[PDB]
Structure 1
């Protein structure tokens, strides 16, 4: 999948959540053998959505300049931003665990369709975009879907330099967080 699905939904809503994943996947842009989420395109599609089973709640973003810090500290900042803004959808502890485990297990998850690695030859650094979609219960025919992307950049030159990171590993890390909250109704189908 283009986004890693993370959800606590009853069976009757799973089909609709799958449609939300399908919907989001149409905005993945592949160029130069690299796949990145197309936020402008997706936001416009939501703005111009003439349906009746999908509603736009809010969209939050944060760009944090490079700071020398431990992986764990960085994950906590990401979790704080999302938890502060979407407390009804995310549990602080669990969210932090999910992000931390992803970035400390990149070697195994590298080939996943929801992660994209890249290097900047000039600056000699590198980055990973992590795409995750959280869905939780809102009638019980509604649920929240939080379309999320986390781009972490670090002063690591090669892809292999990301293997075996631990919560204590310190690097000059920068982060870009994007999260769009949707209210979806059972029966929703990707346009």
Structure 2
């Protein structure tokens, strides 16, 4: 699970979600005991694919340059972007919570493979390479079809040791800089990882 499976789509679709999940998980620029999503590889891969069951339909970025803001402040912000950037899927604060939960529960969540930790030898700082795979239904108007928003969030902040981020809170303030990438897809039942 190199991404985090968040899907409000109905069961019969989840298995296809899984396939979309698996397709993406294949693009990692692993190197240095660390693994980071590979946007060029995962783009070109898409921009080639011959199929009706999977179709690229959008990309976008956003840069929240460092500043002393508090967790739940940047999160509800990140949410704003994904929401707006893709008023095609994301909506309300109902996501600002799934993200915030990750952050305030960082310690454990780390155990998983969709969170890559790394520090800067000298700047004495760190960041989190966080991958999340949102995928919701297209609607009762296209049962077979569903949305899949592959997102990659990098949170950089003036913290040094890994236990550094343990126990953060909605309120905690830090110097956070975050790059946000999210490539939206349109999938149909049956999509299988080529």
* Class of the TM-score when normalised by the shorter of the 2 chains: over 0.9
Aligned to 2:167: 164
Deviations 1:15-74 (A, max 9, x none): 111000110011022211101100110011111111221111101111221111111111
Whole-angstrom CA distance in 2 between matches of 1:185 and 1:14: 11
Instruction: State the shift of 1:12 in Å.
Output: 1.5
- Across the aligned residues of Structure 1 and Structure 2, the Cα RMSD in angstroms comes to 1.0
Moved >4 Å (runs of 4+): none
Instruction: State the shift of 1:132 in Å.
Output: 0.6
Instruction: State the shift of 1:103 in Å.
Output: 0.8
Whole-angstrom CA distance in 2 between matches of 1:163 and 1:67: 20
Whole-angstrom CA distance in 2 between matches of 1:150 and 1:49: 25
Secondary structure in structure 2 of the residue aligned to 1:79: helix
Aligned 1:1-191 pairs, distance under 5 A: 1-138=1-138, 139-191=142-194
Higher strand share: 1
Instruction: State the shift of 1:92 in Å.
Output: 2.2
Instruction: State the shift of 1:87 in Å.
Output: 2.5
Instruction: State the shift of 1:152 in Å.
Output: 0.2
Q: TM-score, normalised by structure 2?
A: 0.95
Range 86-95 or range 155-164, more displaced: 86-95
Secondary structure in structure 2 of the residue aligned to 1:111: coil
Whole-angstrom CA distance in 1 between matches of 2:14 and 2:170: 33
Higher helix share: 1
Instruction: State the shift of 1:182 in Å.
Output: 0.3
Gapped regions of structure 1 (runs ≥ 5): none
Deviations 1:99-157 (A, max 9, x none): 11101111111111110100001211000111110111112100000001110000001
Whole-angstrom CA distance in 1 between matches of 2:4 and 2:63: 22
Whole-angstrom CA distance in 2 between matches of 1:178 and 1:92: 19
**Contact 2:76 2:93 (8 Å CA) reproduced:** no
Instruction: State the shift of 1:8 in Å.
Output: 1.3
Range 156-165 or range 89-98, more displaced: 89-98
Whole-angstrom CA distance in 2 between matches of 1:52 and 1:88: 19
Whole-angstrom CA distance in 2 between matches of 1:62 and 1:149: 11
Whole-angstrom CA distance in 2 between matches of 1:143 and 1:68: 38
Range 84-93 or range 38-47, more displaced: 84-93
